[PDB]
């Protein structure tokens, strides 16, 4: 049968994929992970495919593994299916060419997102999939959630029938992650669509050692083209497959689809090519606008793949005259885009009527597709005609895009609601508006839509909410622009965003605030909001959520309060049912812990229906002046483009706004002042022992400690507290431990550190803090840091050295942070960074947010993000180059050396060349050379002036998290370490891919539940420390800050001046391991993981052994027997144990015995006298050798892969015997 | 499964011509490599040996268990397991949790112990 | 000056791109491994390239390592190069996208050789450039193995000047391999035809910790169209 | 009467530059492509010489 | 019914031996990420590697399996880091069976390894 449910695209063809598959190889990528991660769900839940079975998955290491997973199952003979997108679907190609040309039923579903060029996305374009239509897979489009069902379904039945493989994709966010109300079919109706006979000859034709075959052959130039033509009768089959299937499938579902279905006016002069959900969206405006007598129509692209004309040419109206094709994608350079070029050739090919094409592009990275971009695009064709245009950008520099006028009608159905709802992260928000669509679209005929757009922040940040409900199909594929029902469920954005941007006249707008009264309304709210509150006669509503819910002992927590707002007042249901409904789901979830709970809840609505009346404002509204601008200063860049940015009006920036090749500038994050902590912490100057500890620990360098003499103290307020400076190398020095609220983000590591037992620092309210710690935060910032008066890499020195990785968009209390800060204070003026994609690269690179920063000399890490798989090879790449310009360098000082170049200018060569691989002989001798040779522009002199910047040795850093370096990136990564050369390895070990949402990583151990790893994952933790200490030339180190910073520094110094290569691995706590007591206990987390010898510390150093020493040595102590309190306290572990307890106890004893003998290893490590030799380099030299040079057999064979521009020599093949069978054999015959 | 090195690797090395020809044409840096070869092969024998001759080992188990039944990391979980992206949004997310913004949960404790009312 | 030669297409084009390259990360395919082993060759031996200098080379585990290792030298202002084919070219794409998206002087020769579908094939056709040509690459073809210097040099000087990675490629043994006597240009010639401010710039843009930048942001919808349109005048 | 318009700048593909080469008397033109999409409606090189003469309008 | 369609799994009744085969270039250098995911991930699978210390088919190239002093191409002067030591990196794993062999060594070892492996 069918079935009713709201589900989002994602989930809609996951339903689909699981049925119709016998196997799964899946690796994460957003927004595709999702369908993995549901069909494992399904698959322990006892979940059965049409073959009644379980589906078997596996995880690979990257989207190729996965492919090439695919493609062996597939040749096996198991129905095969994997789900997949952007980056990760350009790893699949080469198996794509493989699975196509081997002519095997294989599914691919993929959520269509943009490529990383000039910047990543994770949103929503077509680049993805227009770059894989050359593999031979057909290609299928869904538009909306209902159709990636459908879709989905008739890839997979065709795919079987016609040996071709199948790619059903759909937009990435808009229709993967839009919830619909939709309807879905049953596994036995799937199932009596598959063609039998089809199936039994796909498992008859597999591979089988019974009745084997060769596959995968190499042929020559006599053979290979006959045989690359040999499978057109099966691609000119799939087109009337798909046809067939789609009338199936509708005569099960009076769903009907073609492989070019048109809708709009049947005489219709202008109409539009699209695919994807565009789709929707033009048809809702072409109902809008047909209706009013325009002649437009839409032709939907469903079969992308096999291109078939007829198809198309049965779809287009003979009285169209003007069409255009809109693509989702940019190829630079091409003539046009592909599915524009693929209308042309149909057109050319007709050789009839030509009625004027143009092409358009839009909606990349998920780029609003509005329906006042669409009436631009149909009012085009009546006007301008404009040709290869853009739409949903200002283009002001190569004058390309089309003017849309946003007063523009709504075109939503007549009765559809739409609402929108501000939610500040984590507040519940998103809970209730998903609860409130299941619960509407289970109780009532209406249709109901949401969507969901998030923060790049990842804590403290804005959500805002997008639904609509209707009694007509929703095809609103764009934002709500035009609400009903607009909700601010946190007061502090009144005076910062545009809340009621667009809201209807007379719709309604609920605050969540505590500004009850005339006189507190009247001082908190805007004149703006005012403003448009009395002229557009809106029903306004103010509830005192926090209040109501403390009162009620929900503890503050307003969303149930702001839930029943919604229910009683967006009009989607009336007073009662919507009350009823409300209160039956209350028991419907909930009765959890108690009917204690479930009264918690009931009391909260009952109050909150009572409290939810109109708040009457004065007519004065009308014209409320406007106010002043205490705005702080800032940059030209941070006014011009990132405030704009932040405060949602990036998509105003015209593209003259960026640099053509997608580069940031460093410390944009300086001018953020967030302020979302709760808490922060407080400093009491006379518990303080001044050790810095505290901001050593801090994940976002919010504390600054001061080091000052009293002359600069004397303009300071009289609350910027200082003490005498304890210490010799200190003393006529005021110390002050200055915290920074705005920055903060409240996770307590520091005051949780704090040594001293009467704590020098301790959590207080925010608001009880930022008056007096603002202005002395921007006092303290003045104060000159005092790198100079300790030693860099000492404890406390580290801290008096300036923090280049500030205030970034990492979670409170993440456990990466506080070490790559560290790095920074150590070597930030001189680095390199190649960053790999993941937490790393999202905290520390999501535009408009530049945490790097330069130092006061305008120096700091030139940071960049190739890919996630490469990030080693582009760390590598760096080197090289700063190998081959330093080579470069020294070349011309040894020149200028014999040339009459002045002693003081020769001086300084010389030494700048005795010690250009050295941090402090090379700035030495280089900052001589840059005062000497100032000004110099001509000959040598100029050329080594102009290559100051080289001057100083650099240190060239790969970052990156664990599924980096464990999975996709280990091979790049082995062969970098294996190089030999001076590069620098940090890998922040959250034991998980942290970033995509905690699925299962090499780097996971034993028994902890993560995605992919649901029952605790059953093999050990990879030990990549023992597998790259076999190399014997590689520094390797392990490191925990809350164990030991001394050790972390020590690791730090040690493993950069290595001159070879050199892997630390740090131990990095994060939200996906569930810290039982919070983020703010990470510190003491680092330590017990080493006191409990779960991560045993050490360091492999090379130079040891070069020495005759052992390069081995162990910096923690045998474990101490406290393991299973430290699994314990920690969710990852402590849920297992809670649902499983039978084999969380075997696991975690199991993670007993591996960590005591893998302590025992490292012990007979440390006390072995066997040890590899260590040697940097020397020898080589002028010259080089071909290892077939005077040998005395051939050393090359007689083929076209050997072959070269001197082979060919004759030789002795070894057909005739060995050399001293051919003399024996010549004495044996003699004559 | 084989002995202690037998003295033979310089034969053997200069017996295939992808070390003799170095040996012809880079005389001192050959000779240097062919040394080397010889003490990384010593080396590494004398480490086969440690593990032959060990009894720290890492034991085995082909497999076992499992079952039906998996478990969401964040189910249960005292503070948000995940953070407010898109990239971990999922259909079941969305709930309020404690974000790690109040301070630990010692320190809240503290805290509302300190201000009551 | 102007000199005879007999030779084959690859080595026509190795002796160009040795004399405008400063770093090349390779990795064995057929039939464009001649070109990796003769640049190895000609820096083993002291050949200079344009500034007095042996090309800086090294091997990768792989193509995908390899392009990787190209985009990183030229983000950090070394003018680089790499040869490669086929399942190989493949295996670069994702960082032919970053090369072209980061407006990066790049220059990839590549011998055109079959995709492997039904079959395995080291012969030549151009599957596997037009595999690559969304990647935002220019595309300069060589039909002759006189042209396969000639355009070779057309396309190291085109993307100094352009900052707009070239992909120069010629049919896998076809070109690659057939033997010709043809005229090449000495290196003293090639390097009179460079344009020192645009290479100057490209150093000057480059990453460097003395005056940084960060590339590779991750953007939201608000402002990626925009940032990917924002090349448009170097096309 | 015949003739070959070679191509030698395949990207950026400039129609200005192929109308360039394209003799006026011109009738049928073959676009020979050294390669396969199966399921294209046709070659890339086919395609974008499609666009051209589409694009011209004449 | 039940039975006719358990006869048409024939081909599936004896235990297969499913293998690997590759050899240094492929296990040492470019499919070493995937190999060392499919033998941690503790599946009965055989690999079987070829060590010829070189990319041999391509024409000699230097892999990481080449050892130190050897000429190959990319190698020109003797390679210059040692053999990368797999045998020993996927010893760390404690799960997987690993085995060195030499035929003209002993026939005997290479039967052995080649029944206890699968
Ligand atoms: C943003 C995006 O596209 C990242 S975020 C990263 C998660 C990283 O895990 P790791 O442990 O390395 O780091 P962590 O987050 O610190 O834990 C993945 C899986 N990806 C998705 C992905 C998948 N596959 C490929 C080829 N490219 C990408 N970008
Ligand atoms: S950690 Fe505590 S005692 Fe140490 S400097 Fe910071 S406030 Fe003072
Ligand atoms: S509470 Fe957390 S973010 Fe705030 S200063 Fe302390 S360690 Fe830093
Ligand atoms: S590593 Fe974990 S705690 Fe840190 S930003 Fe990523 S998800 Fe948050
Ligand atoms: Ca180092
Ligand atoms: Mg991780
Ligand atoms: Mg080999």
New interface residues.
């Given amino acids: 049968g069918k079935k009713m449910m709201t589900?989002?695209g994602?989930?809609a063809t996951a339903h689909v994929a699981y049925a119709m598959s016998e196997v799964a190889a899946i690796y994460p990528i957003?927004?595709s992970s999702?369908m993995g991660?549901?069909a494992?769900?399904w698959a322990?839940?006892?979940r059965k495919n049409i073959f009644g079975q379980t589906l078997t998955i596996?995880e690979?290491?990257?989207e190729?593994?996965a492919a090439?997973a695919v493609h062996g199952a597939l040749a096996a003979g198991a129905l095969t299916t994997t789900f997949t997108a952007s980056?990760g679907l350009?790893?699949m190609?080469?198996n794509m060419?493989?699975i196509?040309?081997?002519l095997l039923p294989g599914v691919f579903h993929v959520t269509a997102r943009?490529?990383?060029?000039?910047?990543?996305?994770?949103?929503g374009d077509h680049?993805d999939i227009?770059?894989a239509?050359?593999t031979?897979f057909?290609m299928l489009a869904s538009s909306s959630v209902q159709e990636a069902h459908d879709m989905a379904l008739v890839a997979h039945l065709a795919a079987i029938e016609s040996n071709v493989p199948f790619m059903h994709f759909f937009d990435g966010?808009r229709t993967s992650?839009e919830?619909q109300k939709i309807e879905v079919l049953d596994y036995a109706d799937m199932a009596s669509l598959v063609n039998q006979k089809a199936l039994?000859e796909f498992?008859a034709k597999s591979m089988?050692?019974?009745?084997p075959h060769v596959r995968?052959?190499?042929?020559?130039?006599d053979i290979?083209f006959q045989?690359?033509?040999?499978?057109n009768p099966y691609?000119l089959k799939?087109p009337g497959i798909v046809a067939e299937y789609m009338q199936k499938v509708a005569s099960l579902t009076g769903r009907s689809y073609k492989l070019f279905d048109y809708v709009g006016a049947p005489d219709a002069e202008r109409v539009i090519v699209s695919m994807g959900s565009s789709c929707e969206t033009i048809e809702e405006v072409i109902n809008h606008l047909a209706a009013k007598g325009e002649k437009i129509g839409l032709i939907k692209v469903r079969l992308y793949?096999?291109?078939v004309?007829e198809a198309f040419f049965a779809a287009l109206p003979a009285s169209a005259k003007v069409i255009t094709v809109l693509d989702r994608?940019?190829?630079?350079?091409?003539?046009?885009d592909p599915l524009?070029?693929?209308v042309?050739?149909?057109?050319?090919?007709r050789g009839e009527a030509?009625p004027?094409?143009l092409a358009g592009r839009y909606?990349?990275?998920?780029?609003?597709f509005s329906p006042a971009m669409v009436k631009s695009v149909y009012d085009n064709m009546s006007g301008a005609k404009k040709?290869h245009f853009?739409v949903?950008?200002?283009?002001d520099?190569?004058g390309?895009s089309l003017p849309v006028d946003n007063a523009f009608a709504d075109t939503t159905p007549k009765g559809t609601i739409q609402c929108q709802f501000w939610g500040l992260?984590?507040?519940?928000?998103?809970?209730?508006?998903?609860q409130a669509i299941k619960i509407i679209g289970d109780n009532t005929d209406l249709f109901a839509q949401g969507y969901?757009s998030?923060?790049?922040?990842?804590?403290?940040?804005i959500?805002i909410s997008h639904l609509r409900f209707g009694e007509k199909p929703i095809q609103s594929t764009y934002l709500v622009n035009r609400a009903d029902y607009v909700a601010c469920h946190n007061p502090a954005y009144v005076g910062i965003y545009d809340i009621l941007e667009g809201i209807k006249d007379g719709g309604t707008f609920v605050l969540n605030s505590p500004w009850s009264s005339l006189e507190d309304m009247d001082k908190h709210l805007p004149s703006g909001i005012k403003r448009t509150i009395a002229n557009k006669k809106l029903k306004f509503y103010n509830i005192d959520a926090v209040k109501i819910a403390t009162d009620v002992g929900l503890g503050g927590?307003i969303?149930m309060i702001m839930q029943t707002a919604f229910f009683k007042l967006a009009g989607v249901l009336p007073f009662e049912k919507a009350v009823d409904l409300l209160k039956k789901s209350i028991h419907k979830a909930y009765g959890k812990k108690g009917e204690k709970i479930v009264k918690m809840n009931t009391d909260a609505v009952d109050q909150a229906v009572t409290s939810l009346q109109e708040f009457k404002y004065p007519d004065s509204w009308k014209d409320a002046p406007a106010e002043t601008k205490a705005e702080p200063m800032t940059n030209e860049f941070f006014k011009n483009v990132v405030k704009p940015?932040l405060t949602?009006?990036?998509?105003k920036?015209?593209?003259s706004?960026?640099?053509?090749?997608?580069?940031?500038?460093?410390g944009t994050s300086q001018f953020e002042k967030r302020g979302?902590?709760?808490?922060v912490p407080q400093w009491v100057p006379e518990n303080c022992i001044q050790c810095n500890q505290c901001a050593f620990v801090c994940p976002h360098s919010a504390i600054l400690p001061v080091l000052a003499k009293e002359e600069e103290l004397v303009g300071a307020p009289a609350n910027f507290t200082a003490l005498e400076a304890k210490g010799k190398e200190l003393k006529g020095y005021k110390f002050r431990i200055q915290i920074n609220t705005l920055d903060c983000?409240?996770?307590?590591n520091c005051?949780?550190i704090c040594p001293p037992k009467e704590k020098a620092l301790v959590?207080?309210?925010l608001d009880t803090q930022r008056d007096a710690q603002v202005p002395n935060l921007e006092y303290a910032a003045r104060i000159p840091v005092k790198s100079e008066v300790l030693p860099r890499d000492s404890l406390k020195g580290s801290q008096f050295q300036e923090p280049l990785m500030e205030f970034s968009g990492a979670?409170?209390?993440c456990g990466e942070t506080p070490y790559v800060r560290v790095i920074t204070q150590l070597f930030?003026?001189?680095?390199?960074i190649?960053?790999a994609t993941g937490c790393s690269?999202?905290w520390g690179?999501?535009?408009?947010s530049?945490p790097?920063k330069?130092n006061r000399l305008?120096?700091?890490?030139?940071?960049?993000?190739?890919?996630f798989?490469?990030?080693?090879?582009?760390?590598?790449?760096?080197?090289?180059?700063?190998?081959?310009?330093r080579?470069?360098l020294a070349?011309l000082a040894a020149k200028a050396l014999e040339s009459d170049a002045s002693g003081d200018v020769k001086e300084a060569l010389q030494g700048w060349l005795a010690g250009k691989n050295d941090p402090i002989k090379s700035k030495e001798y280089g900052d001589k050379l840059k005062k000497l040779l100032a000004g110099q522009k001509d000959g040598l002199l100029g050329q080594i002036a102009?290559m100051?910047?080289l001057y100083?040795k650099?240190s060239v850093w790969i970052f990156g998290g664990d599924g980096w370096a464990y999975?996709?990136?280990?091979?790049?990564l082995?062969?970098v370490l294996?190089?030999?050369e001076d590069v620098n390895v940090f890998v922040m070990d959250t034991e998980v891919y942290s970033?995509?949402?905690?699925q299962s990583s090499?780097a996971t151990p034993t028994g902890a539940?993560?995605?992919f790893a649901?029952?605790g994952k059953?093999?050990?933790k990879?030990?990549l420390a023992?597998?790259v200490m076999?190399?014997?030339?590689v520094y390797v180190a392990t490191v925990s800050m809350g164990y030991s910073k001394q050790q972390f520094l020590k690791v730090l110094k040690e493993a950069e001046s290595f001159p070879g290569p050199s892997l630390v691995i740090a131990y990095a706590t994060c939200?996906?391991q569930?810290?039982?007591?919070?983020?703010?206990?990470s510190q003491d987390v680092m330590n017990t993981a080493v006191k409990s010898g779960y991560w045993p510390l050490f360091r492999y150093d090379p130079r040891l052994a070069a020495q005759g020493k052992n390069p081995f040595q162990l910096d923690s102590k045998a474990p101490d027997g406290s393991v299973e309190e430290f699994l314990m306290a920690q969710?990852?572990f402590?849920?297992?144990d809670?649902?499983?307890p039978e084999?969380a106890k075997?696991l975690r004893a199991q993670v007993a015995?591996e960590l005591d003998?893998r302590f025992?290893?490292l012990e007979?490590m440390a006390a072995?006298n066997?040890?590899?030799?260590f040697?940097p380099?020397g020898?080589?030299?002028?010259?080089?050798?071909?290892?077939?040079?005077?040998?005395?057999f051939c050393?090359?064979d007689d083929?076209?892969?050997?072959?070269?521009?001197d082979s060919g020599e004759a030789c002795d093949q070894n057909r005739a015997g060995t050399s001293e069978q051919q003399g024996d054999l010549s004495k044996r015959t003699k004559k």
């Fill in positions: 589900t989002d994602n989930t957003t927004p999702t991660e549901e494992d769900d322990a839940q006892g596996r690979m290491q990257s190729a593994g090439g980056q350009l790893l190609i080469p060419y493989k196509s040309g081997e943009a490529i990383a060029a000039h910047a990543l996305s994770i949103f680049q227009y770059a239509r050359q031979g057909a966010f992650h919830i039994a498992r089988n050692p019974e009745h995968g052959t190499a042929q020559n130039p290979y045989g690359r033509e040999a499978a691609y799939v793949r096999p291109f004309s994608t940019k190829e630079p350079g091409a003539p046009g524009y070029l693929d042309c050739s149909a057109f050319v090919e030509m004027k094409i909606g990349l990275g998920s780029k609003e040709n853009t949903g950008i200002e283009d520099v190569t390309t992260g984590a507040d519940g928000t998103v809970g209730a508006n998903k969901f998030y923060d790049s922040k990842k804590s403290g940040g959500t927590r969303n940015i949602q009006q990036g998509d920036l015209p593209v706004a960026f640099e053509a090749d997608g580069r940031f500038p460093l979302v902590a709760i808490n983000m409240g996770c307590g005051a949780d959590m207080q309210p979670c409170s209390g930030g003026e001189r680095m390199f190649a960053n690269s999202i690179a999501s535009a408009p530049m790097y330069t305008g120096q700091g890490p030139a940071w960049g993000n190739s890919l798989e490469d990030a080693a090879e582009y760390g590598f790449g760096m080197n090289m180059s700063m190998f081959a310009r080579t470069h070349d102009a100051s910047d100083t650099k999975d996709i990136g280990y091979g790049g082995d062969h294996a190089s030999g970033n995509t949402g905690g090499k539940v993560a995605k649901a029952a059953r093999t050990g990879k030990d023992r597998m076999t190399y014997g030339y939200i996906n569930g810290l039982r007591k919070g983020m703010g206990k969710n990852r402590a849920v297992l809670r649902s499983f084999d075997r015995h003998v025992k290893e007979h072995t066997i040890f590899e030799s040697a380099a020898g080589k030299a002028d010259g080089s050798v071909d290892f077939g040079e005077g040998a005395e050393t090359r083929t076209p892969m050997m072959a070269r521009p």
